[PDB]
Design a protein around this nucleic acid. Sequence first.
RNA 1: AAAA
RNA 2: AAAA
Lengths: 703, 254
Amino acid sequence: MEIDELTALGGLLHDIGKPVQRAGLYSGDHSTQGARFLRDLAENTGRAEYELLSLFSENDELMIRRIKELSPERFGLTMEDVLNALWIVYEADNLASPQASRPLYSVFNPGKAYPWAELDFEKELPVPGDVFSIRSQDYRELVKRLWEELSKAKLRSDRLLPVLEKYLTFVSSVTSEGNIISLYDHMRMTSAIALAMLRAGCTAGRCRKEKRFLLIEGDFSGIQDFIYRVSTLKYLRARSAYLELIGWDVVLEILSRLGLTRANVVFNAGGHFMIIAQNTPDAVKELEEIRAKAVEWLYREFESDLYLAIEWEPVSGREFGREGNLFAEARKRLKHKLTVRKLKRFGEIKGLFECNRLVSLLLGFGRTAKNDAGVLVEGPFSGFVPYLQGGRPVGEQILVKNTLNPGEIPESAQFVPYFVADYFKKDPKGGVATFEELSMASTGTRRLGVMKGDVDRLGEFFSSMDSPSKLATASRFMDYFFKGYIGAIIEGKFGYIIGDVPSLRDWPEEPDIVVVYAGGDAFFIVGAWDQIFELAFRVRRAFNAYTGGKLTLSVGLGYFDERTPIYRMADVVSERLDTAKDEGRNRVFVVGRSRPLDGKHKLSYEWNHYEELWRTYAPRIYAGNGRLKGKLESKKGLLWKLLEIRELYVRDPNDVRWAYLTAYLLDLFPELVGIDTKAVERKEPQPVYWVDGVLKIVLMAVR
Amino acid sequence: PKFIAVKLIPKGPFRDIPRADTLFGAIGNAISAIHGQSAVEELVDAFVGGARISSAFPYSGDTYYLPKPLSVEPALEGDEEERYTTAKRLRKAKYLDLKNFELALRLRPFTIPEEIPYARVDVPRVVLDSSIYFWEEIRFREKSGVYFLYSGPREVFDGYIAPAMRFLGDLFEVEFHEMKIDAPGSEYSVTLSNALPTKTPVLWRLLRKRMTFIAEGSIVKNDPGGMERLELGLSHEVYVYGLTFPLGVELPEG
RNA sequence: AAAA
RNA sequence: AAAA
């Protein structure tokens, strides 16, 4: 041990009492029951540190003697060091911030609650639902697996964070109604604020009213240019993978040089990271060096393409909480410094005004020295050595893909679990499928499907967060939808949650789908055009259930000649995402369309509106699996005529010719024959305007 | 101050909205073809001596557009669901009309154009394996096109800029107009031209061409920019224009 | 390009 | 929303 490791582990384990009082193991309240659990655990196995760490869950005279009985010297600590750790973690617990059957209520919708489950991406989709009691038999099963895992874990924050994450993400931190904070998140932010207070040199209300903390934020800018402008799909995934490693290399560099723990990472999603740190002179000097060195490396490696904007703000304990929302106000002053810094891009290089192994982008990567045999790619501070199943890992830190389990890695190696959505269609060769092979798998027209998606007003959602631990639950839960569950949605899971969606075919066992990126609040996914079309609706439905029906996505879809260069496809779907946003959010740009430019005609559809149109029109004309209804085999012409009629409505929505034509050649589309006054008075389009969204899709499927 | 606006009236699609470095390039070239290098040397002297041209900007009828100064981006906090939404359209806008440009300079409220009088158009063609390539063309709306500003002696304009521009039209026609831009007195300026800076700027966007320019709308403090003579083995010395076209600009304290 |  |  040392005071650092102690204050961090104590921050983490301060509240381990909560699950043991709710498992009914030791009669008393969470404080004493937590002490008893770790003391019981220390005497089992025989690890004395758990009895030292047991002190945290509990005018000091009694405690002074309990601390002496433990003999601090045995662990290389003073009696005085332990008193600080305990007072620090006690303050850290307040700043991070009634029955016992109460579940975690959803941060997306506080009126709905999570069933008890452990974080498992392979199992069922977390859906906020009706408020149920959690039995003290679910908590008892938890506390046993929690005791089994802690018996084996090396007792460093990196081996403890994961087991606390497996088992306590879906546990309420405090069993009050409308409570939104995950216990795991409360625990990691208490450890975060604790280690920072220690590092800020404060001891024995000083650090609370003083600016002893830094909020550090890093935002990458030019990500689109870095990723989508090249000269193949393989390359695109490789650049995407590369950006995530560059970002980790900078995050772990800051944690390493400031003497901090992965618990100090509030979030690392979508090219944004936030870290809580000590406001010391040593720390600001150490950040400026890292900022300067990371920018110089980006400039040399990719020219002006990929910038990293790093800023920090001095902050007090006050500002981690409410007083009438100081935390959001602090985060706003930080954002503003980041916007200024993004308008001074590469200003940290005074010199300014005078790929062979990439594509290949195993269980993770070793973060080693730049100069090391086997280094496949390099970041600004470190080399990355691929960690393969049949091989041994290399480096101080090990990045491990899509598990919270350390595995057969050395005990000196820092465990850094990272989640990535990397689903791809496997080809006969076994390689990741090409634009061409995906396009070829399409129903009817051979086109590549491309979709870009975005949560609406994420910034707004995050700024109604009062506390670090709230924001930590918000960012993690948001990130895990995209990193954790989009793979499962692609595989065809959650059929009962998703329901009937616009579809042109039976969902394949192995979909013609490759993810480029899914993380933070966004996705870029390509595949067979008909499978991409359906996937937009599956993802929107999964996301609606995942939130409380309180958060919305907008999506841009496009259907392209497989020979269209990436940069065009990305610009067109980017334009259509932007269009869906500007027309009101919670919209999908389904297909390219013509319209009157009278300021009344939206190009995108409201999700529910398109889904009702599909329900209404598709079954009357489309059999499924590339097949028109029997009625329409010899009358496929009716469908083109409706589109020709719709063009004369687009020419002039006011000229009433289109209505004469609709009556004459139509009982297959009755709701298009009469003029709808209801729409006219409401200043909205005629039904005919909307129908192309369904007909164009059917006609693509049936060619 | 007051300036000469050079209106390029387009007789078909353009390939690019030209910025100051390529306008100077073309003008310098034309003058070489008409009066020889003697005259190129004098044009350079006039510019080093205080003369300036802006980059080309859209006009529509009697409406002149100017680059949105980067000064207003950090200031945009001057509803809850209206701030974020408008704020993302202010950040996306490349151009303001003359009147709204003059308001932005003094950090007063201003409105964005709703239409831009041109359209970038990626025209596709199959390249016989087959691939698809795009050529971008700027199609202008009706009575619309592109203009740039000249600041300096009338004799440099009459003797070099005017004759250069007619030769260059040979595709466009050219007409000249007086333009007044009200700008506040200030330690700080916006450039209406892309520029090779001599100091580190206040606010900027980079522009890679290999040369590193700051973009039209960037903010400088007493940066006149600079020209580069350089040798590419191609007979004549080539001059690269990166002088600033400064208008005074009020900043927020940040 | 709403944290890609 | 010059991939109207």
